[PDB]
């Protein structure tokens, strides 16, 4: 059923409310043991978000391997996605260990560091040139090298050097910096703007390890990133573009993820989006 009606009939009817609560309902449902250790408890952001033993990030250390962190693998697309949490004082080291060893090209983040008066996450990289950051913990340095502000969202160049081998590489972070403090984007125009600029960069392409996705707890305004990407690349490979089932999709993404996509305006938004969209992957 072509989605741009299913969306009409839902609006109608007023049933997002609905719809969303059945997708709840429906979601996977696997073990987080690792999350939940005792020695792991200041490494979570949030007591109700944790990532399945199954689909975890590892760190490659034998002291303690965790983060708050979680791969999407989406066979029938062709992409990965790391989706995570906002930086804690305690993870920010991690944080950029997991980048190194995943040997991502981007970081896309999709929140303030303050929001509605409080702290969403760690001031994790640096905002002067010449004021570099060091993690002791991780023998890692991240310098500034470029800043592009725009209206809607600034793109920076990084330099992140693993100290222990004296190798370098350009990680671009791209920081979408209007999403409002309650509810969401009136227009989606300047989100798939957005998704389009980290497109056009290389970040979410196959000769890169994934990207690395977060706002603050890495379920919600993440989940709906990868949800939008991956319906519109569904689109432009399938012959029939309408067989995209969204509500599908976000079950697929839910078996490596618990709660992508936090709320019934959330997916709104999602169905907004694609459609949107597609009036470009469709020969616009
Ligand atoms: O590597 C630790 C570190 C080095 C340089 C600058 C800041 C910094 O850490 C701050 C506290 C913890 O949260 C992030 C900001």
Redesign the pocket.
């Known amino acids: 059923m072509e989605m741009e009606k299913e969306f009409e009939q839902i609006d109608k009817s007023g049933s997002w409310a609905a719809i969303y609560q059945d997708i709840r309902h429906e979601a996977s449902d696997f073990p987080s043991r690792v999350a939940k250790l005792p020695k792991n408890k200041n490494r979570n952001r949030y007591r109700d978000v944790s990532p399945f033993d199954h689909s975890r990030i590892k760190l490659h250390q034998e002291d303690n391997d965790y983060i708050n962190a979680s791969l999407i693998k989406m066979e029938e697309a062709q992409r990965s996605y790391i989706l995570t949490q906002g930086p804690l004082?305690n993870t920010?080291?991690h944080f950029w260990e997991m980048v190194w060893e995943q040997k991502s090209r981007g970081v896309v983040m999709l929140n303030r560091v303050m929001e509605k008066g409080s702290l969403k996450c760690?001031?994790?990289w640096p905002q002067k040139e010449e004021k570099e950051?060091?993690?002791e913990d991780t023998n890692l340095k991240l310098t500034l090298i470029s800043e592009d502000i725009k209206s809607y969202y600034t793109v920076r160049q990084l330099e992140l050097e693993n100290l222990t081998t004296q190798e370098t590489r350009e990680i671009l972070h791209f920081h979408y910096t209007t999403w409002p403090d309650f509810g969401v984007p009136e227009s989606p125009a300047s989100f798939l703007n957005f998704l389009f600029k980290v497109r056009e960069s290389g970040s979410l392409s196959p000769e890169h390890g994934p990207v690395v996705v977060h706002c603050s707890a890495g379920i919600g305004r993440s989940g709906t990133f990868c949800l939008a990407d991956t319906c519109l690349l569904l689109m432009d490979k399938r012959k029939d573009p309408s067989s995209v089932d969204i509500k599908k999709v976000l079950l697929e993404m839910r078996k490596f993820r618990m709660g992508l996509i936090q709320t019934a305006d959330q997916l709104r938004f999602s169905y907004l989006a694609v459609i949107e969209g597609a009036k470009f992957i469709m020969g616009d």
């Open positions: 004082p920010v080291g760690a001031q994790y950051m060091i993690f």
